[PDB]
Paper text:
Vesicle amine transport protein-1 ([name]-1) was originally isolated as a synaptic vesicle membrane protein, abundantly found in cholinergic synaptic vesicles, and suggested to be involved in vesicular transport. Although these investigations have suggested a variety of [name]-1 molecular functions in cell regulation, amino acid sequence analysis has indicated that [name]-1 belongs to the NAD(P)-dependent quinone oxidoreductase subfamily. With analysis of the crystal structures of free-form [name]-1 and NADP-bound [name]-1 complex and additional enzymatic studies, we revealed that [name]-1 contains a conserved NADPH binding cleft and binds NADPH to function as an oxidoreductase. [name]-1 comprises ten α-helices (α1–α10), five 310-helices (η1–η5) and sixteen β-strands (β1–β16), and forms two α/β domains, designated as Domain I and II.
We observed clear electron density for the bound NADP molecule. In the NADP-bound form, the nucleotide-binding tunnel is filled by the bound NADP molecule, which adopts an extended conformation and is almost completely buried inside. In the binding tunnel, [name]-1 forms fourteen direct hydrogen bonds with the bound NADP molecule. At one entrance of the tunnel, β9–α5 loop (Ser222), α5-helix (Lys225) and β10–α6 loop (Tyr240, His241) from Domain II form the phosphate-binding site and tightly trap the 2′-phosphate group of ADP moiety by forming six hydrogen bonds with the site, indicating the importance of the 2′-phosphate group of NADPH in [name]-1 binding. The nicotinamide ring forms three hydrogen bonds via the amide group of the nicotinamide with the main chains of β14–η5 loop (Phe326 and Leu328) and the N-terminal end of the Switch segment (Tyr285), whereas the ribose of the NMN moiety has no direct hydrogen bond. NADP binding induces conformational changes in the [name]-1 structure. The major conformational change is found in the Switch segment. On NADP binding, the Switch segment moves from α8-helix of the other protomer, which results in a shift of the protomer (by maximum of ~ 6 Å). We thought that the large empty space on the nicotinamide ring plane in our NADP-bound [name]-1 structure may be the substrate binding site for potential oxidoreductase activity.
Numbering used by the authors:
A (entry chain A): 46 to 388
B (entry chain B): 46 to 293, 300 to 389
The structure:
C-alpha cells in the first residue's frame, strides 16, 4: 500500500518535479491536527514560481509543493472538536499539498459542502479567497463600478469575474488571449481584450476614457504603473502578483532584472494629489490570521450554496503528468483551474 | 446698503486677511449659476494653510478665502431647474466663501433640510464629506475594525468619530489635547491620546499590539510612515493633509517623506490612499451621492455637527487663532453680523 508524492528537488524546468513513493505509515495526528488523504490538488501560478525559485515562501529544498487540496480526514488529533474521521475538507497550507497523504492544522481546513465535488473544492480556496479580498476588502467593489481583471481566463481571473457578477451593474474589462474571449463573455467579462496583440490601456480608454474603478494587478513591474494610471477618482489598484517574471520553463534573468529596475513606488504627495489607492495582497502572508481568512471562506461557501459562484475546472492531471499540467498553465492554454490527482 | 467680504492680501499671519465692503449691486447670475446670501461660513485648516502660502489650490492674490457656506438663494441663473429663490442651500467651492453675497455653479449647492440650522449646514460639508470618503470609500470601515482618528477634536475629527459610531463595534483611537479628551469620549472616542505629550504609536501599540485597521493621516510627513506601520493586515492609511507643514523647535524626522513600493505593500498586505477634496470638482455625481448619504445619516440623528464657536467677520483673526492655537473642539464658523 504505497503513497504517491511529488517533490521539487531543484529549481528549473518541468523535469525538476519528480514522482516518488513512500510506505503508508499509520496516521498519527498531533494535538489540534488532522491527517487526511488528498483526492485533488490545485496548480497555482505560485507553484510555477516556486519551481523556478521565485516564490520566497517556499521551504528549503527538497520539498513537496502545492498550497491547496481537498480530501478526506483519516485521523483526527486531540483538541479538534468539529472534525471526525471521514469528513471531507479543503485544506490551505504553505506547502506539501502535492502528495497523497498530508497532516495539517485542523484550523486550516474547511468542511466541503454537500453537492461540491473534490475538484470544485480544490479549485475554490486560493483563487476565490484572493479574488474576494482583492475586490472587496481592498477594492470595495460597489454597484456601478468598473473593474479591470487581468488574466481573466485564469483561476483568480474567473473567480473575480464571477464575484463581480455578484455585485449589481459592474462593468468588467477582462484581458486574455483572443481564443479565450468567448469563454470570457460566458463568465461575465463585459469587454474582452487581448493584451498579447494590443495595448489594453488604449482599448480600455477607447471604451471608458476616464478609466476604471478597480484594477487587479497580477502582472507587476511596469504594468503596475499602467494600472495606477487607469484609475478613476477614488480608484484602487490592488497589486498581488509578478506574473511578468514567468516567460518559460527556466528562470530568465532578463525579466528578473527588468522588473527589478522597473519597480513601482509611490509617494504620499503622489497619492494625495490624485484620488487613488495602491494596495498589496499576499495570501501566503496571511497565515496566522485564521479568523480573517475563515470569515472569507464562510462568505465564499455562502455564495457557492446560493449558486453565485462555481469554480471552472480547465483540466485534471495525474501526478505522473505533473509536467504537462504545469505546461498547461505556463503555455497559456488553460481557461480556469488546473488540478492534479494522485494517479 | 453695502455687502461685506474678507480678502487675503498677502501670505503670512492673521493680519493678512482684511475686511472690506462694496455696494450691493442687483444679483445677476450667469447660466447655470446661483447668487446667494451667506448666513454662516466655515473655517477650515486649508484656509490657515492658504493664508500662510501653503495651499496649492489657492487662486492668485488678492482673493476671498473660504470653501464652504450656508445661505439663501437670492437669484437663479438660466438653465437651473432644481433651485428657486429663497431656497436654503449649502455651497461648496474652491474659494470666495468669506463674504455676504456669492455666485457659484448651481451644481455645487445642496438643499439644506429643515430642522438643520444654517450653522450646522455650514459645518456639514467639508468635514463630513472628507470623513465619509476617508472612512468608507477608501477605508471601507466594517464592524469590528479599529480606526486611528488624528485630530479627533477638530472638524474632520469629530465628524469621523460620529461616522465611526454609525458602524457596529468600532474601536476609535483619537488624538487631541488632554483637555479635549473628555469631549472626545463624549463624541465616541474609545481611547483618547495626547500626541503633544506622548508617542501615539507607543500608546496605540500598548493598547492594541497588532495596530489598527484604518489610519486617518492629516499630519503627513514622517507621521505617514508611522501610520503605515500601525496597520493590521488588510489595513489602510488614508493621508489627506500636510498638517506637519504648519508647525508654527524643529526635529530631524520632520524632513521624512513617505515612499512605498509595490512589493512592500504586497508583502505587508496594506494599502496607502490619498484623498484631496479640492481635486474632486467636476465630479459632482460622486460628491453628491456622498452628500445624500450624509443628509440621510443626519435625518436619522446619527450625525450632528458640533459648533465650537461663531465669530463675526471683524473678529476673523480671533476665529483663526481659535484653530491655530489648538483651542477649538468642533467647527469654527464665521458670520457677517453687525
Ligand atoms: N498574492 C496572492 O495571494 C495570490 C494568490 C493567488 C494568485 N496570485 C497571483 O494571481 C495570478 C494568476 O494566478 P492563477 O493561479 O489564477 O494562474 P493563471 O491565472 O491561470 O495564469 C495563467 C494564465 O495567465 C496568463 N498569463 C499571463 N502572463 C503569463 C505568464 N507570464 N505565464 C503564463 N501565463 C500567463 C495565461 O493566460 P492568457 O495569456 O490567455 O491571459 C495563462 O493562461 C498570478 O500572478 C498569481 O501569482 C496571487
Ligand atoms: N484633503 C481634503 O480634501 C481635506 C478636506 C478637509 C480637511 N483636510 C485636512 O484635514 C486636517 C484637519 O482639518 P480641520 O479643518 O478639521 O482642522 P482641525 O481639525 O480643527 O485642526 C485643529 C486642531 O488640530 C490640532 N492640530 C494638530 N496639529 C496642529 C498644528 N500643527 N497646528 C495647529 N493645530 C494642530 C489642534 O488641536 P489638538 O492639538 O488638540 O489636536 C487643533 O485643535 C487638515 O489637515 C486638512 O488639511 C483635508
Amino acid at each position: 500500500p504505497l503513497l504517491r508524492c511529488l517533490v521539487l528537488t531543484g529549481f528549473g524546468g518541468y523535469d525538476k518535479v519528480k514522482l516518488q513513493s513512500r510506505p503508508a505509515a499509520p496516521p498519527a495526528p498531533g494535538p489540534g491536527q488532522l491527517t487526511l488523504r488528498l483526492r485533488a490538488c490545485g496548480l497555482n501560478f505560485a507553484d510555477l514560481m516556486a519551481r523556478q525559485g521565485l516564490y520566497d515562501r517556499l521551504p528549503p529544498l527538497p520539498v513537496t509543493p502545492g498550497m491547496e487540496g481537498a480530501g478526506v480526514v483519516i485521523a483526527v488529533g486531540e483538541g479538534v472538536s468539529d472534525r471526525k474521521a471521514g469528513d471531507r475538507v479543503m485544506v490551505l497550507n504553505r506547502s506539501g499539498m502535492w502528495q497523497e497523504e498530508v497532516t495539517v492544522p485542523s484550523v486550516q481546513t474547511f468542511l466541503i459542502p454537500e453537492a461540491m465535488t473534490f475538484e470544485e473544492a480544490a479549485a475554490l480556496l486560493v483563487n476565490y479567497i484572493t479574488a474576494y479580498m482583492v475586490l472587496f476588502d481592498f477594492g470595495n467593489l460597489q454597484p456601478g463600478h468598473s473593474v479591470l481583471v487581468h488574466m481573466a481566463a485564469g483561476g483568480v481571473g474567473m473567480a473575480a469575474v464571477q464575484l463581480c457578477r455578484t455585485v449589481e451593474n459592474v462593468t468588467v474589462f477582462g484581458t486574455a488571449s483572443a481564443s479565450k474571449h468567448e469563454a470570457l463573455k460566458e463568465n461575465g467579462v463585459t469587454h474582452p481584450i487581448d493584451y498579447h496583440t494590443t495595448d489594453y490601456v488604449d482599448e480600455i480608454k477607447k471604451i471608458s476614457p476616464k478609466g476604471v474603478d478597480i484594477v487587479m494587478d497580477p502582472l507587476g513591474g511596469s504594468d503596475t504603473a499602467k494600472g495606477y494610471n487607469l484609475l478613476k477618482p477614488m480608484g484602487k489598484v490592488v497589486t498581488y502578483g509578478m506574473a511578468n517574471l514567468l516567460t518559460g520553463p527556466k528562470r530568465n534573468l532578463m525579466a528578473l532584472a527588468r522588473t527589478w529596475w522597473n519597480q513601482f513606488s509611490v509617494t504620499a504627495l503622489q497619492l494625495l494629489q490624485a484620488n487613488r489607492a495602491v494596495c498589496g495582497f499576499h495570501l501566503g502572508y496571511l497565515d496566522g490570521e485564521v479568523e480573517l481568512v475563515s470569515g472569507v471562506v464562510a462568505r465564499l461557501l455562502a455564495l457557492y450554496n446560493q449558486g453565485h459562484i462555481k469554480p471552472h475546472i480547465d483540466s485534471v492531471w495525474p501526478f505522473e503528468k505533473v509536467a504537462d499540467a504545469m505546461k498547461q498553465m505556463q503555455e497559456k492554454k488553460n481557461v480556469g483551474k488546473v488540478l492534479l490527482v494522485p494517479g
